[PDB]
């Protein structure tokens, strides 16, 4: 009896049903969301949440845009900060504090990101941070400390790749992995208000990755997630979302390590990219649906819900109270990777919260990165093309 079957039964008997459109395809993220919902729906008297999978996040934004064109929107959806800026163009979003949802205690790294013109429009829900995954066994085998600096990280990848006859730093050639190198080389996407994709720190970041392919220390992954490719050739390291934790744990045939990111110096860890989503509440929803959403949002921000969701997934607990919950404490005392995830969440950067950013990051910036890595395009030429295509897209709206 699958949690989604139990939810279908709950919603059938309910007097009111708030749909929640999401981008979890399966694994621990989809399961944790549904177990949370089952427990919520049990607690209510004929008022229920119905999670509806819409594919991935890009499929979810496409289906939400189509739902507006049809005039049939869900009560709630997942939304990254760029999707919030898009939905605010249509004044489609209910301010969260208008429902009476208390947000005291929500980590300000997460709450500042959902605040637009001083108004909170989203509840942080599944917020990830990039971490350093590694092969504890392969580092021990060659006497290599877990690198704390970018310099150390490059040296380790060179040493281990030479020892093992193959590139040990695995990466997707995408905007998320670029962001780690960009940010920690001192890059910023906004210069005096303007989006800039071809800055010298962008060129430096893409050049480092392309040189790591050429020098035989970096392995581009082109088919599936890094965790779906383990087993083929030697693996030492990747830089990847904390929501990958359970997928890495299931796939790895070696002893898996999680570390804080290599930074410019030992003074501080490297910044990680914040990914994952907020829950938003649509204005088009019925007052009765919005009251369900208010209850469900106060449930999701409860310390026990935050403790169960974060320990099941490797998402970052979004509240201070979650770290004080005994279920979280018992997990963390048995598994030091939860503390390492939280520690990394202190050193956290976001991508621009622009309405156009989904298209930009995938179809323009993502594409320039694949052109340089997979087709050996000059990094500067590839990013100059991305700059002009982004400038054309921004000016057209």
- The footprint of ligand FGO (CB under 6 A) covers 24-25, 27, 29, 56-58, 61, 80, 82, 126, 128, 176, 225, 227-228, 241, 243-244, 247, 275-276, 357-358, 361
Given Cl ion, ligand FGO, none, residue 24, with its beta carbon under 5 to 8 Å by kind, binds: ligand FGO
Which residue in this structure is represented by tokens 């990051």?
361
Cβ closest to ligand FGO, residue 14 vs residue 182 = 182
List the beta bridge partners of residue 48: 17
Provide the minimum distance between the beta carbon of 79 and ligand FGO in the complex, in angstroms, as a whole number.
Answer: 9
Given ligand FGO, Cl ion, none, residue 276, with its beta carbon under 5 to 8 Å by kind, binds: ligand FGO
Cβ closest to Cl ion, residue 28 vs residue 386 = 386
Provide the minimum distance between the beta carbon of 24 and ligand FGO in the complex, in angstroms, as a whole number.
Answer: 6
Locate 141 and state its tokens: 């085998």
Locate 314 and state its tokens: 């490797």
Given Cl ion, ligand FGO, none, residue 336, with its beta carbon under 5 to 8 Å by kind, binds: none
b vs e for 84-105, b when ≥16 Cβ sit within 10 Å of the residue's Cβ? bbbbbeeebbbebeebebebee
Given Cl ion, ligand FGO, none, residue 253, with its beta carbon under 5 to 8 Å by kind, binds: Cl ion
Provide the minimum distance between the beta carbon of 230 and Cl ion in the complex, in angstroms, as a whole number.
Answer: 4
Locate 345 and state its tokens: 């969440």
| 8 A C-beta contact, residue 237 and residue 161 | no
Given Cl ion, ligand FGO, none, residue 329, with its beta carbon under 5 to 8 Å by kind, binds: none
Given ligand FGO, Cl ion, none, residue 275, with its beta carbon under 5 to 8 Å by kind, binds: ligand FGO
> In whole angstroms, how far apart are CA 68 and each of 80, 178, 230?
18, 33, 41
| CA atoms of 156 and 152, how far apart (whole Å) | 6
Cβ closest to ligand FGO, residue 53 vs residue 95 = 53
Provide the minimum distance between the beta carbon of 98 and ligand FGO in the complex, in angstroms, as a whole number.
Answer: 25
Provide the minimum distance between the beta carbon of 72 and ligand FGO in the complex, in angstroms, as a whole number.
Answer: 21
Cβ closest to ligand FGO, residue 10 vs residue 128 = 128
365 in the Ramachandran plot: left (φ > 0), alpha (ψ -120 to 50) or beta? alpha
Provide the minimum distance between the beta carbon of 276 and ligand FGO in the complex, in angstroms, as a whole number.
Answer: 4
Residue 281: alpha-carbon gap to chain centroid:
20
Nearest to 182 by CA among 245, 224, 130: 130
Binding site residues, Cl ion, CB under 5 A: 174-175, 230-231, 252-253, 366
Given ligand FGO, Cl ion, none, residue 153, with its beta carbon under 5 to 8 Å by kind, binds: none
């Amino acid at each position: 009896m699958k949690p989604e079957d139990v939810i279908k039964e709950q919603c059938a008997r309910a007097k009111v049903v708030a749909e929640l459109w999401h981008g979890f395809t399966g694994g621990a993220p989809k399961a944790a969301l549904e177990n949370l919902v089952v427990e919520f729906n049990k607690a209510q008297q004929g008022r229920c949440v119905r999670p509806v999978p819409q594919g991935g996040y890009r499929d979810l934004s496409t289906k939400i845009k189509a739902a507006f064109a049809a005039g049939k929107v869900p009560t709630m959806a997942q939304a990254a900060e760029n999707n919030i800026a898009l939905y605010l163009e249509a004044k489609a979003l209910l301010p969260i504090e208008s429902l009476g949802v208390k947000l005291q205690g929500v980590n300000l790294t997460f709450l500042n990101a959902v605040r637009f013109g001083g108004v909170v429009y989203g509840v942080p829900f599944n917020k990830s941070i990039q971490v350093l995954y590694y092969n504890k066994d392969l580092l021990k085998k060659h006497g290599v400390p877990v690198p704390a600096t970018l310099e150390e990280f490059v040296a380790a990848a060179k040493k281990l790749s030479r020892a093992e006859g193959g590139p040990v730093y695995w990466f997707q050639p995408d905007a998320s992995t670029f962001a780690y190198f960009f940010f920690n080389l001192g890059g910023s996407y906004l210069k005096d208000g303007k989006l800039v994709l071809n800055s010298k720190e962008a060129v430096e970041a893409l050049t480092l990755l392309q040189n790591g392919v050429k020098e035989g220390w970096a392995k581009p992954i082109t088919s599936g997630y890094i965790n779906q490719n383990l087993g083929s050739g030697p693996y030492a390291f990747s830089v990847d979302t904390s929501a990958g934790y359970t997928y890495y744990l299931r796939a790895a045939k070696f002893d898996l390590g999680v570390a804080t990111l290599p930074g410019r110096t030992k003074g501080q860890p490297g910044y990680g990219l914040v990914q994952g989503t907020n829950l938003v509440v649509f204005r088009q929803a019925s007052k009765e649906e919005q009251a369900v959403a208010k209850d469900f949002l106060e449930f999701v921000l409860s310390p026990r819900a935050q403790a169960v969701f974060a320990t099941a997934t490797g998402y970052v607990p979004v509240t201070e109270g979650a770290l004080k919950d005994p279920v979280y404490q018992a997990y963390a005392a048995e598994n030091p990777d939860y503390a390492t995830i939280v520690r990394q969440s202190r050193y956290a950067k976001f991508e621009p919260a622009l309405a156009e950013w989904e298209q930009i990051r995938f179809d323009i910036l993502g594409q320039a990165i694949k052109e340089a890595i997979l087709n050996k395009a000059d990094p500067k030429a590839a990013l100059d093309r991305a700059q002009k295509l982004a400038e054309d897209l921004l000016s057209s709206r």
